[PDB]
Write a protein that binds this ligand. Structure first.
Ligand code: PC1
Ligand code: PC1
Ligand code: 3PE
Ligand code: 3PE
Ligand code: 3PE
Ligand code: 3PE
Ligand code: 3PE
Ligand code: 3PE
Ligand code: 3PE
Ligand code: DGT
Lengths: 368, 167, 96, 173, 341, 117, 54, 48
């Protein structure tokens, strides 16, 4: 909110950030370390969304730099198909059965009708969900606000747009809603959301500017498909989130300047809504007592594994998402014997890790 | 009114036995009937509620009486009070169960369930052991039950002596 | 009998208290109303027994302290009832 | 004597209390009975100290539940039951008749009133409630009072946590 | 003890409340401890995020209030006639006390409230209810010496506890009916001794302490979720579910030793007929445990494929794996235990 | 007592006679459909008075029940000061009033004494 | 040979809210999988006063 | 042999498990009323 010019200098944290990447924050940690002491005017969450290929990433980086905000790059399937040691899981796909073959954005743009599309869309929701929670931990433990490109709240638009084009089936949409309902309610909605309304014709021109191989060659980015996204952002997402978060709309800040945009944000006031307790605007982040602050911090810092275990919703009547038992055995063999997947990250000796005899530590909010 | 079934030999005191068995017929009937009218059937009105009490208790009285009569009749007719008598008794109550449930098979099979049940009861009476005997061993502590005490308050002096009294 | 001439009346009153605590009334408060009715009768008997002792009536205070807390706690749960269901009617609760 | 008539009234008010439906009808019935039970208890005791306390304690509970009755069960109905009025009035006079023709030396409770005590009882010549309430604040029973204190204070922490004041008022939505 | 400093308090005050009951040398003192225990559990049990949880906070309150109320009623009546905390020869007035305590613990004839309040509890709440709340009630029943009333509850407990459980799919509701059966074994073990009961209770809590974590750590609430649950090594998932067999009391595992010592003493006391009804009825309890193992013993399943990864808490899992290890290999340590001799 | 009850009844009879005189001594006129209508500043009323009246001091309302039941335990103090052990009486009494104050100040600082807002 | 594995149709047995559904129980539906039932926002009826003129 | 064996026994046990479900599908009041009935009987026998 207070840019570097307003403060005249870099952000001055109220107190030292808690090392949330390395130390857990359970109940007994909360007794000695309090949460509210670190919150500033800039302790907020910003979602910089827009249509496809609207230069959100460039705008976010510049924006997050002015407001001294942490910038979180948009999720991609490389986070699933590239392990920590850097090995590419996709190289293993010749071995795997066809149903378990790797699927990415490239594939979606090239064979959008494949049954793995329903899988692919749920993964994006799951990835955004985990990343979104990671931002909250950074906010609550460091007090520095975060800038996100696309929140999990906005992800159902792509699933809905894909459904209208007929790529998905009725079942896949039914499954997606149950996951979203089962999980979405546990997040804190963003303080501010910024939208970059590029008209439909413009984005179609803009996509060809990137000159990405598969996108230009693809057929998915049709007028109908791209039009569906526009109708979904404005009619369903933006109309809903504005009840909680401040909403700014620009034709394209990616093509425009950000210094004007930062000066637009700082004009927006975030305290007028604080007066009424039950006011919907920014309701989620209204904690009366210090206990409520710590509870939210504990939930995301210490109970994220619970948050990521709600995605277990059993639905087998849908045939697309089900993975056959015979494939699962084969897939388990190949997947978990790949270099670096034998053990948890940081223990695979064959990948060069050393000292395992005297090593006993595991990461926090780490897998396995 | 308080008659015990085995107060006399097997082929004796018919009126004493019928009262004893009908006692347990009514008690079990009402006990189950209370659950039936509140938790399962839930009749409405003060009259139909009695029908559930009669329905669940009535034939259950017929069973007990039938067993006593058939068991008593068999004891005299055959000339000996042996296990087959109670087996013969059980099939009578089973027959009444079918008439109650309007089911030919239910009465027949339930008679066998009841038939072998009676046989074992006679086994107990004739051999001299009990079904729910008073516990002979009742343990009220560990090994150190008199030693393990943790209280802090000082126990003031005693007032009794284990020693033999002085005079 | 002694128990009939002296202790019958409070016991008969107590069971009538329970039969209020189980009868079908729409509002949850009907349970709370009958709750401290029973407590009032429990005090009455307990006060009979404590007075068979010459000086032990001080324990009446101990009993009263727990009487209010169960009523006070009983009232708090009702408040939490309202702010999830919106109303306290028994028939509004899932039958399980 | 009035002890028997107190027996009749407490019985009578209890019969009707079983038949109340309206919460305030229950409350009025209960309030009337709290008077009688308070009166009756002091008859069979060396003092009325506890009747005062009991009366005071319950009146606190009487007000509070009206506040919630008037917020939750405000809109409800009464129904005069001619069966009930006759039945209570029928038995009430019937019971009152017995108390006049009762061997009311036999009906009196054996618990020793202050006057029922002997003249030699030296401990009965002190203040009205000195000894009885004494060991509420002496070793070792005092710790029980202390235990209540935490229990009451810990209770005071329970209500605020169950209540969650900050999430709004209470309305019968 | 999961969210705030306040939850830490309520847990401790629960311990104090239970201890006051089982250390009290009179009925009245015992009854007070129950009241202390009552309000220690409700705030732990009530959470407004769930419409179901507040309903659970109700059914428990109405039941427990009635139980303590009737319990105090009889205790006053008991010493109105005997003038002692103890009755020389047990009679009806002592039966009434027993009836309240059984309802306080949800034994068979008065168990109805107990499963019907398990819909809206977190797993950690169910453990406190299933294990700890049954200490104070059952421990006072050891004082009363009525046989037929106690005996009837056992026979109905094992029956109702088993047959009811076959029809459930909610694990929280299933465990309730499972717990009612194990409750039946306690009361049977309680008419013979307590040291068996103290031993048997400790093992029962141990197994339930384990199964609760596995559901709690992976937030499973329905049978279907077990099949959909993802685990890296199907061998690992296969072994975790081998705790249910111990909860079924199969001898190769630790969970039978408790059942075993309860039979070596019931048989020693000539209660042969009881054991027939109990042990036979335990099979039905063993049945629906196997229905859970359908998701483990078969070990190649059709599972949803939008998960490749297990996200689990360390410390709970760290303590859960240790507890599981003994739950499968704990038998050879019977040599060490010296509390049965 | 028994003296007080008699005068309690006698007073109640007397006060009862007072309106029973008023009900007769009162001028009598035909009651109108509007005369008996409620008073709400001369305009017909929108809302029955028996609608749910929202509450904001509910939390204090419960705390009131508690604080009274500790008044039951302070009142006996005086009566047993001449007769009790002074250490036990002194110690316990103080840690009774400190507990109360600490409870009060704790909630006051937590803001529970403030009304719903 | 072909090997049978627990299939979707096998597990449909466990899909309902109860193993042996009947008329009463079949009508029900499985609770939310996260076991949280968010309370539903309802109406707001506020009393009114014609404060004044009298 | 399997009429008295398993398949029928299951068909009966499941049938009872249905019945116990309805017995659990009642208001909380009914169960408490059941308890009070039990108490009243014991009290009545006490007078005798
Ligand atoms: C006006 C409010 C001013 C800001 C908050 C108080 C600042 C003064 C610190 C006094 C000590 C802490 C008081 C407090 O916050 O309650 C205990 C808070 C929690 O309050 P609570 O609402 O969860 O209830 C606490 C219940 N007991 C007392 C049983 C634990 O924190 C703690 O309990 C442990 C940390 C104490 C030190 C925190 C500083
Ligand atoms: C819960 C806490 C409640 C605490 C308040 C208790 C008293 C509230 C009673 C309110 C009136 C109840 C009622 O409507 O009954 C009507 C009853 C008649 O019942 P009814 O059923 O015939 O009324 C309806 C009439 N029809 C059928 C025509 C619609 O009338 C009375 O006699 C009530 C007399 C009340 C006297 C005033 C009480 C003041 C007490 C002061 C303190 C004690 C001194
Ligand atoms: C484990 C389950 C075991 C169940 C049964 C155990 C008891 C075994 C039967 C013992 C027995 O004595 O059976 C033979 C008995 C004949 O004895 P009796 O009654 O005297 O008649 C003929 C001689 N007059 O006749 C009977 O007792 C009837 C046996 C019927 C068994 C049906 C199964
Ligand atoms: C199988 C279902 C059987 C139900 C139980 C039958 C039964 O109640 O038998 C015992 C009963 C009383 O017999 P008794 O040993 O004399 O004990 C009385 C103590 N008051 O009744 C009797 O007198 C026993 C008569 C034989 C009943 C055989 C039933 C099979
Ligand atoms: C088709 C179904 C029809 C409907 C059900 C019909 C049955 C309804 C029965 C309702 C009445 C049940 C209550 C009966 C109470 C009898 C007394 C009691 O409580 O049980 C004790 C009883 C005898 O007591 P006991 O320990 O043996 O000591 C000797 C006493 N003279 O113990 C006994 O006598 C036990 C008798 C049965 C033993 C059966 C053992 C064999 C089981 C084979 C299966
Ligand atoms: C088919 C369904 C019905 C199955 C059979 C049910 C009837 C089981 C028998 C009734 C219960 C137990 C009877 C009993 O107590 O037997 C005791 C008997 C007498 O021995 P004793 O120790 O000397 O007696 C005490 C001192 N007088 O001595 C003994 O019998 C002790 C030896 C062990 C007895 C175990 C009997 C239970 C067997 C259950 C089989 C269950 C069906 C399995 C198929
Ligand atoms: C029809 C039923 C008729 C029966 C009468 C019911 C009305 C009751 C009115 C009398 C209440 C006052 C009373 O009885 O007090 C008794 C007791 C006095 O005890 P003490 O301290 O020794 O003083 C004696 C001085 N002579 O002190 C107490 O017990 C406490 C009394 C509190 C009184 C509150 C006022 C109630 C007013 C009547 C409400 C109706
Ligand atoms: C010497 C003791 C020093 C105590 C310091 C207290 C200074 C300020 C007190 C105050 O009232 O400031 C406002 C503060 C805010 O508390 P709040 O949640 O808004 O509740 C209403 C408060 N009037 O109010 C409070 O939080 C606490 C108010 C009560 C504090 C009393 C402490 C007395 C200790 C002796
Ligand atoms: C002489 C006759 C032969 C001896 C009878 C032995 C009975 C064992 C029956 C059995 O195999 O289990 C029955 C049932 C499982 O039967 P199942 O074949 O698997 O049916 C398909 C289930 N989906 O599983 C079950 O019913 C649970 C086991 C219960 C067995 C005892 C029940 C007795 C109740 C009284
Ligand atoms: N099916 C599907 N595709 C998505 C989703 N989110 C992003 N994409 C795909 C759509 C396009 O093929 C492609 C567009 O990438 P982006 O719009 O995110 O651009 P990028 O973040 O790389 O940089 P920029 O937006 O220009 O700042 O990614 C989704 O939720 N579902």
């Amino acid at each position: 909110i207070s840019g570097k010019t307003m403060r005249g200098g870099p952000r001055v944290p109220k107190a030292a950030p808690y090392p949330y990447k390395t130390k857990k924050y359970s109940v007994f940690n909360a007794i000695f370390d309090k949460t509210s002491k670190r919150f500033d005017e800039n302790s907020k969450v910003i979602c910089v969304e827009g249509p496809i290929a609207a230069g959100k990433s460039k705008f976010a980086k510049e924006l997050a730099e002015e407001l001294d905000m942490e910038y979180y790059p948009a999720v991609d399937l490389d986070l699933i198909y590239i392990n920590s040691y850097g090995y590419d899981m996709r190289k293993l796909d010749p071995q795997l059965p066809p149903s378990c073959r790797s699927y990415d954005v490239r594939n979606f743009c090239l064979d959008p009708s494949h049954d793995l599309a329903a899988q692919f869309q749920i993964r994006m929701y799951m990835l955004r969900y985990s990343q979104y929670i990671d931002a909250l931990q950074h906010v609550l433990s460091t007090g520095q606000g975060v800038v996100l490109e696309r929140s999990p709240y906005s992800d159902f638009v792509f699933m809905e747009a894909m459904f209208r084009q007929g790529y998905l089936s009725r079942g896949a949409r039914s499954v997606y809603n149950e996951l979203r309902q089962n999980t979405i309610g546990e997040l804190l909605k963003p303080h501010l959301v910024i939208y970059l309304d590029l008209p439909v014709d413009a984005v179609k021109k803009q996509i060809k500017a990137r000159n990405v191989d598969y996108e230009v060659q693809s057929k998915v980015f049709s007028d109908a498909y791209l039009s569906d996204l526009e109708q979904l952002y404005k009619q369903q997402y933006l109309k809903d989130i504005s009840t909680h978060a401040e909403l700014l709309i620009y034709d394209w800040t990616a093509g425009g300047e950000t210094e004007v945009v930062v000066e637009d944000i700082e004009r927006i006031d975030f305290n007028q809504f604080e007066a009424d307790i039950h006011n919907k605007k920014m309701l989620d982040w209204r904690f009366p007592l210090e206990a409520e602050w710590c509870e939210a911090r504990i939930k995301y810092c210490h109970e994220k594994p619970d948050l990521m275990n709600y995605f277990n919703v059993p639905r087998f009547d849908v045939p697309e998402l089900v993975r056959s038992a015979d494939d699962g055995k084969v897939w388990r063999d190949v997947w978990f014997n790949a270099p670096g997947m034998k053990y948890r990250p940081g223990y695979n000796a064959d990948m060069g890790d050393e000292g395992l005899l005297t090593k006993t530590k595991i990461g926090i909010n780490q897998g396995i | 009114l308080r008659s015990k079934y085995y107060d006399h030999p097997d082929g004796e005191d018919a009126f004493g036995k019928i009262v004893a068995t009908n006692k347990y017929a009514v008690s079990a009937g009402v006990a189950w009937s209370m659950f039936d009218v509140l938790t399962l059937s839930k009749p409405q009105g003060y009259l139909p509620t009695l029908g559930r009490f009669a329905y669940n208790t009535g034939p259950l009285m017929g069973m007990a009486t039938a067993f006593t009569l058939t068991t008593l009749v068999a004891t005299n007719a055959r000339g000996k009070d042996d296990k087959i008598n109670y087996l013969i008794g059980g099939f009578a109550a089973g027959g009444v169960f079918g008439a109650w449930k309007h089911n030919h098979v239910a009465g027949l099979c339930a008679g066998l369930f009841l038939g072998i049940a009676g046989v074992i009861k006679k086994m107990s009476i004739e051999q001299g052991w009990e079904f729910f005997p008073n516990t002979p061993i009742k343990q009220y502590g560990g090994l150190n039950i008199a030693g393990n005490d943790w209280t802090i308050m000082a126990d003031p002096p005693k007032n009794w002596t284990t020693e033999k009294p002085k005079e | 009998m002694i128990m009939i001439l002296y202790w019958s009346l409070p016991m008969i009153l107590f069971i009538l208290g329970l039969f209020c605590f189980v009868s079908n009334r729409k509002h949850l408060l009907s349970m709370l109303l009958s709750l401290e009715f029973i407590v009032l009768m429990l005090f009455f008997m307990l006060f009979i027994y404590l007075n068979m002792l010459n000086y032990e009536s001080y324990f009446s205070m101990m009993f009263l302290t727990f009487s209010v807390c169960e009523g006070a706690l009983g009232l708090s749960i009702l408040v939490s009832m309202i702010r999830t269901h919106g109303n306290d009617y028994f028939q509004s609760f899932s039958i399980m | 004597m009035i002890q028997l008539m107190l027996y009749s009234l407490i019985i009578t008010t209890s019969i009707i209390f079983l038949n109340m439906i309206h919460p305030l009808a229950l409350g009025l019935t209960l309030l009337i009975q709290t008077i009688f039970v308070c009166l009756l208890t002091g008859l069979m005791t060396k003092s009325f100290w506890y009747s005062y306390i009991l009366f005071l304690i319950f009146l606190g509970g009487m007000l509070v539940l009206f506040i919630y009755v008037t917020s939750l069960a405000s809109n409800e109905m009464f129904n005069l039951s001619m069966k009930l009025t006759l039945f209570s009035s029928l038995i009430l006079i019937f019971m009152l008749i017995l108390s006049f023709i009762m061997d009311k030396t036999s009906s009196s409770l054996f618990l020793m009133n202050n006057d029922m005590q002997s003249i030699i009882n030296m401990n009965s010549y002190f203040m009205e409630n000195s000894l009885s309430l004494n060991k509420l604040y002496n070793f070792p029973t005092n710790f029980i009072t202390i235990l209540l204190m935490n229990y009451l204070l810990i209770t005071l922490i329970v209500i605020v946590k169950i209540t969650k004041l900050f999430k709004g008022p209470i309305r019968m939505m | 003890m999961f969210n705030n400093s306040s939850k830490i308090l309520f847990i401790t005050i629960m311990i104090i409340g239970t201890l006051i009951t089982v250390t009290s040398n009179s009925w009245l003192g015992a009854w007070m401890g129950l009241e202390i225990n009552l309000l220690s559990f409700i705030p732990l049990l009530s959470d407004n995020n769930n419409l179901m949880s507040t309903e659970a906070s109700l059914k428990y309150f109405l039941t427990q209030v009635l139980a303590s109320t009737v319990l105090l009623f009889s205790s006053i009546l008991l010493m109105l006639k005997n003038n002692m905390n103890n009755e020389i020869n047990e009679s009806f007035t002592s039966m009434i006390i027993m009836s309240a305590l059984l309802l306080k613990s949800g034994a068979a004839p008065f168990h109805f409230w107990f499963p019907n309040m398990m819909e809206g509890l977190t797993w950690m709440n169910a453990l406190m209810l299933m294990t700890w709340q049954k200490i104070a009630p059952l421990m006072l029943i050891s004082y009363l010496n009525i046989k037929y009333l106690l005996l009837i509850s056992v026979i109905l407990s094992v029956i109702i506890g088993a047959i009811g459980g076959l029809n459930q799919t909610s694990l929280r509701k299933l465990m309730a009916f499972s717990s009612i059966n194990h409750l039946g074994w306690m009361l049977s073990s309680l008419m013979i001794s307590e040291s068996i009961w103290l031993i048997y209770f400790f093992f029962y809590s141990f197994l339930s302490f384990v199964l609760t974590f596995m559901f709690n750590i992976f937030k499973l609430f329905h049978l279907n979720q077990l099949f959909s649950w993802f685990v890296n090594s199907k061998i690992l998932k296969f072994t975790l579910f081998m705790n249910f067999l111990s909860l079924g009391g199969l001898p190769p595992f630790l969970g039978f030793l408790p059942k075993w010592l309860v039979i070596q003493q019931l048989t020693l006391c000539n209660q042969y007929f009881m054991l027939t009804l109990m042990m036979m009825s335990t099979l039905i309890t063993l049945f629906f445990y196997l229905r859970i193992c359908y998701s483990a013993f078969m070990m190649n399943y059709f599972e949803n494929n939008w998960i490749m990864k297990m996200n689990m808490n360390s410390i709970n899992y760290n303590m859960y794996m240790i507890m599981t290890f003994f739950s499968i290999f704990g038998l050879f340590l019977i040599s060490l235990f010296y509390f049965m001799f | 007592m028994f003296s007080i009850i008699f005068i309690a009844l006698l007073i109640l009879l007397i006060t009862t006679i007072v309106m029973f005189l008023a009900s007769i001594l009162s001028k009598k006129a035909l009651i109108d459909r509007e005369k008996s209508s409620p008073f709400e500043c001369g305009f017909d009323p929108k809302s029955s008075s028996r609608l749910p009246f929202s509450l904001r001091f509910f939390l204090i309302t419960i705390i009131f029940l508690i604080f009274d039941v500790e008044i039951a335990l302070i009142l006996p103090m005086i009566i047993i000061m001449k007769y009790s052990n002074i250490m036990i009486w002194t110690i316990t009494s103080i840690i009774f009033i400190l507990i109360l104050l600490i409870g009060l100040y704790h909630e006051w600082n937590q803001g529970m004494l403030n009304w719903s807002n | 040979a072909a090997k049978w594995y627990p299939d979707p149709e096998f597990m449909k047995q466990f899909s309902g809210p109860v193993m042996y559904p009947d008329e009463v129980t079949s009508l029900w539906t499985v609770p939310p999988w996260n076991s949280k039932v968010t309370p539903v926002e309802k109406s707001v009826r506020n009393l009114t006063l014609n404060f004044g003129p009298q | 042999s399997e009429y008295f064996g398993g398949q029928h026994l299951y068909q009966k046990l499941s049938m009872y498990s249905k019945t116990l479900f309805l017995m659990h599908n009642n208001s909380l009041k009914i169960y408490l009323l059941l308890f009070v009935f039990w108490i009243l009987i014991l009290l009545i026998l006490l007078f005798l």
